[PDB]
Symmetry: D3
Subunit: 232 residues, 6 copies
Amino acid sequence: ATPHINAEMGDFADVVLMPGDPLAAKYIAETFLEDAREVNNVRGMLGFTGTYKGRKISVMGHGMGIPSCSIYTKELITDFGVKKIIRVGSCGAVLPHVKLRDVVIGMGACTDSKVNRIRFKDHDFAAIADFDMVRNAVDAAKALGIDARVGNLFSADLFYSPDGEMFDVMEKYGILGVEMEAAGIYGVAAEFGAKALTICTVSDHIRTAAERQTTFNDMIKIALESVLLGDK
Amino acid sequence: ATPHINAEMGDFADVVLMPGDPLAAKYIAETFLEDAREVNNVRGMLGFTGTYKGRKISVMGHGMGIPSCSIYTKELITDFGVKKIIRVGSCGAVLPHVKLRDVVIGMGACTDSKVNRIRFKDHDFAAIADFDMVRNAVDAAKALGIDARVGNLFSADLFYSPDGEMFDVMEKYGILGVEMEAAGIYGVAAEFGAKALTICTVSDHIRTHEQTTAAERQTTFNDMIKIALESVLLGDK
Amino acid sequence: ATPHINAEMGDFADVVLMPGDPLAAKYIAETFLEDAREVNNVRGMLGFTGTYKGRKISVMGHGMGIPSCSIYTKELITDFGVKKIIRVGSCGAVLPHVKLRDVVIGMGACTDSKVNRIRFKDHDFAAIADFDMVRNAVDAAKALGIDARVGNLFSADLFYSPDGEMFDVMEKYGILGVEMEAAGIYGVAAEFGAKALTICTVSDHIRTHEQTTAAERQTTFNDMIKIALESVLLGDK
Amino acid sequence: ATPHINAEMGDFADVVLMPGDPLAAKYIAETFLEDAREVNNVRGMLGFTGTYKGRKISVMGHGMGIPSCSIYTKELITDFGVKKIIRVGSCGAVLPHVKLRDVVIGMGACTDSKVNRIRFKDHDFAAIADFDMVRNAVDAAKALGIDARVGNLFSADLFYSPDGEMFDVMEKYGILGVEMEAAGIYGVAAEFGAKALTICTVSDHIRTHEQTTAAERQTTFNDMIKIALESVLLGDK
Amino acid sequence: ATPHINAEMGDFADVVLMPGDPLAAKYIAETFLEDAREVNNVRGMLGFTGTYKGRKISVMGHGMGIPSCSIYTKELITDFGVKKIIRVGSCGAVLPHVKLRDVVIGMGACTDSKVNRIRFKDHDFAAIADFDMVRNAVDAAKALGIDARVGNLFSADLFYSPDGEMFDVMEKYGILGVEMEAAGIYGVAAEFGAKALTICTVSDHIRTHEQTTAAERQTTFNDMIKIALESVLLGDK
Amino acid sequence: ATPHINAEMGDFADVVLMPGDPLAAKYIAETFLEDAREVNNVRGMLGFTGTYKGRKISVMGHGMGIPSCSIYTKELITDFGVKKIIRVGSCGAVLPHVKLRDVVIGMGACTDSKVNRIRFKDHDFAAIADFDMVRNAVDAAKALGIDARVGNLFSADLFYSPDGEMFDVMEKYGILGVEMEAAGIYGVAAEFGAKALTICTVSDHIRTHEQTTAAERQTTFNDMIKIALESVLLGDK
């Protein structure tokens, strides 16, 4: 067990899907995994392991923000032998061209966090996903006929930013979506030699429960299917 | 309701105790409060409201890290009329003398996060607690015969930091404890015109992560929570 | 002696009041102290030691700006065995409800100087006063019937800042007063293991551009010094 | 014409291969292109335009470093309707398991330049390539029996860095190769709404001090240009 | 022979003039220099060595940008026994009284590049020219009956800056011209114990963007070179 | 009168010499000036006006540190029509070739202060002196048969730096002397359109840490003042 995870080596698969919401992880395990058992409940951060089309797969919330997910992903990679992390969350759009409910894949993630600067001697570290995983997600999305843009995310430290101007800058530089974890996860993946990817669904443009349901399931399918592609 | 809290004005007291652990909020609610009603369960971030010695009080987790706690503290202040946040958590010690199960009070909080620089034109904002709230906790501690030290906390962005030397730096300038939230909560409070305080038990020394028995953990915890609640009553006077 | 103080160990009390102006220090020694003797005149930065109600106490100017006061406070702490430093000066107010002649006590001190980032590996160091010193001042002030607000100061590097917008930032985040030394002095105290407090009187309002008259100055000045001295004796208990 | 390119709209294709060396640009037009008409020679920065397997294609030097290549790529995009830009150059390796003559594709580019900060309010802009162009190059490399590693480059401002420690950091975070332009190119691409890509061949190993020979240089170089050209075709389909 | 210069010790005089343009360096060798011999052409960065009034003197391009010229000037100093570097280029003016085609001598050079911060522990290094070299350029200029303005240059990383507002800042602080190298060359000069100077002719107005003829650009260019060459002779005395 | 200078227009010459020590300003006025009159004594910062070889000249302390001198130089320039400031103080050497009592002239001034970044949009401002004033100083030193080196000073915020390693960096990049004002003064000169120059005598080594008599300290001190006064007469050409 780790300081934040009450489980033993083997309890997780070598690939973990991670929403921000513990309850989202719960719904994923119950909806897409088979014979899914609970493996973590410390701090209510619900973690489950099961199988998807024969493939052993884990899902577990990571909570909100870079420092929260940095703890969880780190402990998974170093003490649970996890190799691939796929964050599956939502984000805000700044580009008018980006439609509500669109699926975005962050090959990169900008940030206003300082954690990568602390890692990289206060220089510019390009927080990037694993290309193979990005590819797998793009293919899996086509096989499902779902349109998915591939580009930069922006990982915010402040959900409620005192600087509205920054949004004009993100837009000028083509940021697909604004969330709060990607850049941080990519940093941890680089620090501890694993691989990761963030996939999001535009929950709103920052500028009903019906659609919001399947649109979520699309993303999960893409994530799950993409693992199978990577398995080949 | 707010995006992260499913409740309505009045569901919260004007004061909120906040541990990082939602489960710790549930324990506090059940252990110390009367007639506790759960008021939020969004993202599993449990919040409760009840009374302590006649006083209406709330307790709710804030999650780990400045960004997490910054969301909840903000929403409570803007949409739930909260006037006071008391963070109740645990920290790792850097100073040789600070004893385990010593209660540290963060009148100030250092940090390596960038959020206050973003707020303060990239100058040095001193993230501080409300002075009166600090005195109230100091006073409650003395009444309860509990050793409390007042000074600087340090709020880390990285629980697993690659910069090990920083702890020597923290030690040199007298940082009392390391956690991951204080400086962000103080930021929100200043930005949004509220008052805040962080109190922490000492869970270990950062160098030489000792083992801690369940008993001494629960015992020192209970003392912290009592200082929190009592200091509120003092402030009410 | 030190490069900037021509004196011997023991020529200073373990507590030193410090105005920025040496002439104010002179005035303090002759007006409030008994048997005051001059202990320094290097660079005309006059220093004195005498007694107040049977208590050995010193007073000495620190000059203007963090670099200047950083020198004297350091030398006092390391080479004269000084344990406590109380800065007494004036500040400009950025908040409307902070009134001319108000007494402000800086539990924290913001800054745009780089000295603390130099000490603290370029992270956010919360430049804080010593808590007991703060409470001593608050109490000593209540006893004297004088109102005092406790919060953040802002220590500026440039008296004539090219950045007018910054004041609006200070006001948004609740800065009580603008001066030029506290954060620096707090930094020295953290670095060399001593205790510091900064007390200011509002000598003008950056918004209304109002200034204190000749007579108003002395009135509030004596109140400030009285709160300083009468906070030491509380500390001695 | 632009201030650094004495050509006119039409002279370039919508795709431009760009080595640092102008002579290497000359070499490409002569060896891999047909009907190669020189379109520029200002400051000796040779630029050409021929065709490859029927596809209209340009090739031009960008000079050494971010500032240099920022000028050219900017003018190409905004004044010559260029849509894609593929850099082709050599890089140093810090990873042990990255061997000489390797083909690294930078989907990301780290840097110690300040240009992206100036662009991005001093926050962290992740300088990235266009994804399609990245896959196009990976696929073309497969079709030619080459294993192209995708990941981060480091774009240095100083070929002769005074900070030897930095190479360890690059290695620690998996930087595939060290060059001097990728990050700035990706920067211009985003600023002006264009697609860019950087392909590099490991010409030496910073650690072991090995360096490719004259022949290995020309061999791998050709393979690189081949992948570069072929990839463009894949993108057209 | 170095990575970017194909030549051996002695092939360069101990003083080198450097335009940004290789072709400008060629023009100089063939026009001002006697017995001019090409000593480099790697990457097309043409380098020459000949004599001026009996004095051995070299002239070579340095390309555009701090990173580009940092390579060449560095390699000249440590591998070719170069003692003096004189940059000879053009700059854009921000000040009103700085006239088109005026000759500006960079006694200091500001920059928005991070290279000196990387050298100087993230503090402010004043990137300055060598005094005597400056005096020599001033005197030699008076002899030629040419007015030269001595002051600050600004070395930009971006020729196409996203921050127009910055030029207003340069104007306010008395920046005589905006180029792209001076600060890097002074950086290298200080790092490796050499002496450097940048001279520039005002090519245009950042402000009025009027225009100049080739024939008058030529006149000014020659004045700059004559001043450069003559200043060397003054130094030898 | 200004907030820190109790005098009226005309009381000061258009050139003001300024040591850090007010008592040093008093000594200069008594020793070199004729018909010297005190024109300021606020905060004990004595200022004087008189004549030297028939030339009207002022001398006044500026205190210790960039923040203190910035206040005085600004007020003198904007409210007393002062056009030229000549700092005359002491510094520490880091270079072996810089011997005790050497006279160094700061053509440039590095710094770890943030004041110039606040001014210059967080870019590198090359804090420079007026060239003519520098040359005037060099020449007046020649005629007086005194050795004076021209180069970079370094203006420190902390006389007691927690970063001892920075002194190695100062040496590596040729810093002639270490003081606490030059960069600030030059920043003011540039901001308010005046001209400044800092001259220093080497008072000690941060290397060997030796000192001299009270006899030769004054000897070379007078030499510095002579160079500064004579340099003004030269500038009257």
